């Protein structure tokens, strides 16, 4: 224990490469998290993601803190990512929203702070406000106005890291291109596996230093209306489940030692007490060139995580190529 | 920023784990000694976490005395500190194994290494000499079974001297050898090789990776060249223009895209200078990255040439670099 495989950021800061992921549906008790994280934590887990939106900070903060005080881990030792949520994007919402994920995590800093999604909405309790016919109350913000307040909270100390999410390479540019930029995104977390592997994507972030994050890197909650049902289980596939037998290991390591040797921080939800330990077995073995060349192969420019909800407004991130 | 305990590690088959940017000590002869222990200051100082060593380059004195002034100092713990010893070829004998260990220990003052390694699978004749030979100048082979000499390999780190075991110049077939072997306890956390992009290793890489062996590349910067050691009309690796073409492009140097290369496909990168700038300079390969075209660009420069053939060790059956890998 103590040492764990990092990569360094471009601010300085180290990020574990295998993050547990904390969202789950609506349907499922949010003290499920609570339960998860621990043993996530117990199991060798040292990145935790979550976001304001996924509505469970007190209990991953909660999760973290028990790890901690029962000195199974040091809060130096805990990686902890949150997100701003859309209807925060305006530069006096930035630090509030940050606080207040603070507040119920009961933490004095985040390590990282994500702008959650491109879009924003009509500041408000609600995440996804609608109007009279059931439309979005899209908001208009400039994002880099969002990104100055953001480098404030990391001047401030309340995230260690800044980075972004769901950005395509015309929204990169926007922010690596800021006059009198200060801080770069460390990261731009998005979908990623090999169905949909990013590798432009994935080129453009490496050639700027900007580490890419790979989120429904197991094929996804497959949550309606959210994801198609009618899209392909990942883990079903072929190749994977072929690869998998060879290894004597599953199709979820296959996918997720996939994204550690192409160079991608990837993360994984379970709630699974056997496969959150399960995961964390992605150290213990290596995949050759030809096999991930297979994996390569695998790829079929299907996006699970549309979030079309979101789509008209001039930022919405997936109408592009990359 | 955090110049911390945090740094880039890789997870070895025997759960521990190892820097992957390390530290070469070895300087050509004409080089005094001495420094080594400045060198090795420096480049705790600049972020290096590992230290590469070996009984055969006379300088573990010197080397562990840099890192005992640098944890004594208050500048590292030991449990941030991965140095690797080599065993030499004149104690490849099992009863000489662990006495073998004891005395670089004795050397460095330390209580153990994080790693060691069988140094080269050719076997000479056991004694102070560490290329023995008679008196009309032929080198002194030794018989031995490399089987019986990691079975002494796993004995010392069941005592706490070496935390981790592995070998170095092994080929496919000494590596098959190991792991096919009747009542085998550890494997090799690692198979340190000559590896940078005019001999780029891809068979043996991906061999290793098929065992989750770490692949550990020496001579990455196309190496110290000294004579009569490596053919010096062998080219320049840090020379090439693609290198430099690339260099230029990232406002790097042919040096820092070299070791960034190793880092991307899964290799631990040693790389050695005794200069205090390129020290420093040499650290900065966590500073940034190389896209899938610059590593395929790379990946063409392969041209099969082997800067360091150890010929002088060529004839007995283990010499381990006339097979194809
Ligand atoms: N920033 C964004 O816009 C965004 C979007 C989506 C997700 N995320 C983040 O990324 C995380 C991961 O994404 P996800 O939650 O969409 O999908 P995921 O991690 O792709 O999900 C994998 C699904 O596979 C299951 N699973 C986990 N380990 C397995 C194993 N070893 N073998 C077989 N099945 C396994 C999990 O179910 P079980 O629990 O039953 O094991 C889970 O439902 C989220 O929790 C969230 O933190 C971010
Ligand atoms: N196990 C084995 O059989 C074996 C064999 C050979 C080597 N090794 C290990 O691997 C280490 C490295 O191998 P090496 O010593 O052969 O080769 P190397 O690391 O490839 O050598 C690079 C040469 O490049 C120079 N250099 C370093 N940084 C540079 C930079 N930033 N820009 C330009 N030049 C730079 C150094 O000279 P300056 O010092 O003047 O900077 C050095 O002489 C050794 O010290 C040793 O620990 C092991």
Request: proline share 6%; charged share 25%; net charge neutral.
């Amino acid at each position: 224990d103590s040492k764990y495989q990092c990569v360094k950021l471009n601010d300085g800061h180290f990020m574990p490469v295998l993050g547990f992921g904390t969202y789950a549906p609506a349907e499922v008790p949010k003290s499920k998290a609570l339960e998860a994280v621990k043993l996530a934590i117990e199991a060798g887990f040292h990145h935790i993601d979550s976001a304001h939106v996924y509505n469970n900070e007190e209990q991953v903060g909660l999760a973290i803190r028990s790890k901690i005080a029962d000195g199974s881990v040091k809060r130096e030792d805990i990686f902890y990512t949150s997100k701003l949520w859309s209807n925060s994007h305006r530069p006096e919402l930035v630090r509030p929203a940050l606080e207040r994920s603070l507040k119920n995590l009961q933490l004095d800093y985040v390590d990282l702070y994500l702008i959650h999604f491109p879009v924003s909405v009509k500041p408000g309790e609600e995440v996804i406000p609608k109007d009279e016919n059931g439309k979005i109350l899209f908001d208009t913000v400039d994002l880099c106005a969002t990104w100055e307040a953001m480098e404030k909270c990391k001047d401030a100390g309340l995230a260690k890291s800044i980075g972004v999410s769901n950005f395509n390479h015309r929204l990169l540019e926007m922010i690596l291109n800021k006059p009198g930029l200060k801080y770069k995104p460390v990261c731009n977390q998005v979908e990623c596996h090999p169905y949909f592997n990013q590798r432009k994507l994935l080129d453009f972030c490496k050639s700027k230093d900007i580490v890419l994050v790979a989120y429904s890197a197991l094929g996804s909650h497959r949550e309606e209306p959210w994801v198609d049902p009618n899209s392909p289980v990942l883990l079903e596939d072929p190749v994977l489940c072929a690869l998998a037998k060879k290894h004597k290991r599953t199709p979820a390591l296959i996918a997720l030692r996939y994204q550690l040797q192409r160079g991608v921080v990837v993360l994984a939800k379970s709630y699974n007490e056997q496969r959150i330990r399960q995961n964390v077995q992605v150290f213990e073995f290596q995949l050759t060139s030809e096999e991930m060349k297979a994996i390569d192969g695998l790829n079929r420019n299907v996006r699970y995580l549309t979030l079309d909800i979101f789509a008209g407004p001039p930022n919405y991130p997936f109408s592009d190529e990359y």
